[PDB]
Amino acid sequence: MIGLVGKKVGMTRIFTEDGVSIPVTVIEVEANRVTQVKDLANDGYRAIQVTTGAKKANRVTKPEAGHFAKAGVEAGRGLWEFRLAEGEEFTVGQSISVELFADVKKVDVTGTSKGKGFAGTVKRWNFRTQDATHGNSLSHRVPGSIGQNQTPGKVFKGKKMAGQMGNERVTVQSLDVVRVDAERNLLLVKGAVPGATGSDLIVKPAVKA
Amino acid sequence: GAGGQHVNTTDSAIRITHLPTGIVVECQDERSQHKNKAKALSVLGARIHAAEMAKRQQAEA
């Protein structure tokens, strides 16, 4: 089924009654109301478009304000379009609570990662540091050789080099869900999900069953 | 050993290993590997010959 846009709220751990402790991530997942049910008429494909959160009305833009008061939904932060699965079918403005994750047991939380910045190759691609004594000169962390010689005559496309690491979008897969709460609107998933606190985690039921 | 740029690149050294007997002999004498190899077949042949003649001559006495 569809996914749910929530917010990352830190990490904690839950002690089971029988003895183990599980590191969980708390995700506050508000109401994800639909602003546009796309279907095969004007798009060829079918989908929904959800929103959540809130903004100041003197901070939202006049195109987007008409895009939200078209549906009557309160203009929040972002929009996120989810692909439909031919069995479930929503309408415009139909709010979607946290209670789609009752019977499910595995999720795929996707969030924008934490940008480590311009990382060099040791931290970025796990290269190996050269010998930091024994004659070595000015070359303790540099990435070594990058190509062969006169026959290749260039570097191959997709050479692992240095540069921006993180602040990408990644996907943790197949997390065992822990506990879903109604009034608190919290989705406890086991283990780390990407991004620092305040991210926008899209949580959908896991495709690898 | 010595040679200059020739040693650094050309192989010019040969081990020959007689497998059913386990007698190696390494000849590393001259610049060309052929006059290392023919030597490492002569001394190999003489060591199969003397290592057999000590079995026969061992079983005499």
């Binding site: 751990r13 002690f15 003895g19 183990v20 402790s21 | -």
Partner: protein, 122 residues
């Protein structure tokens, strides 16, 4: 975190005193052993009347690490000295008779059940 070249005291009374790890089993390019893994040691120092001697290459199994083992609740059980129990390479069935000092509850898995009855603790 018992890896290669690490000296280990001997837990039991088999006959060694100080043994050196030389190889970690159970995988290719495995870095270090842990709680209760089988390792391969040689012996650096024996008592004279023992069953084993110096240089005697055999398998041990680590039972105490200063790095410690982790319980599932989030605990850790750090000892204050690394140690092992000498085994037999061909049938593990440890050569020693009685084991000096504690062991740790993860060693209770169908082949060290002799050890945790010879052990005095945990």
């Amino acid at each position: 975190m018992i890896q290669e070249q690490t000296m280990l005291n001997v837990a039991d009374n088999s006959g060694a005193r100080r043994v050196m790890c030389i190889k970690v089993l159970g995988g290719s390019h495995r870095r270090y052993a842990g709680v209760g893994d089988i390792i391969k040691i040689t012996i650096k120092e024996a008592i004279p009347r023992g069953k084993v001697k110096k240089g005697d290459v055999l398998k041990a199994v680590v039972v105490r690490t200063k790095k410690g083992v982790r319980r599932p609740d989030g605990s850790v059980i750090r000892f204050d000295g690394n140690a092992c129990v000498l085994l037999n390479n061909n049938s593990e069935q440890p050569i020693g008779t009685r084991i000096f000092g504690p062991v740790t509850r993860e060693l209770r898995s169908e082949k060290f059940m002799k050890i945790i009855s010879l052990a005095p603790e945990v």
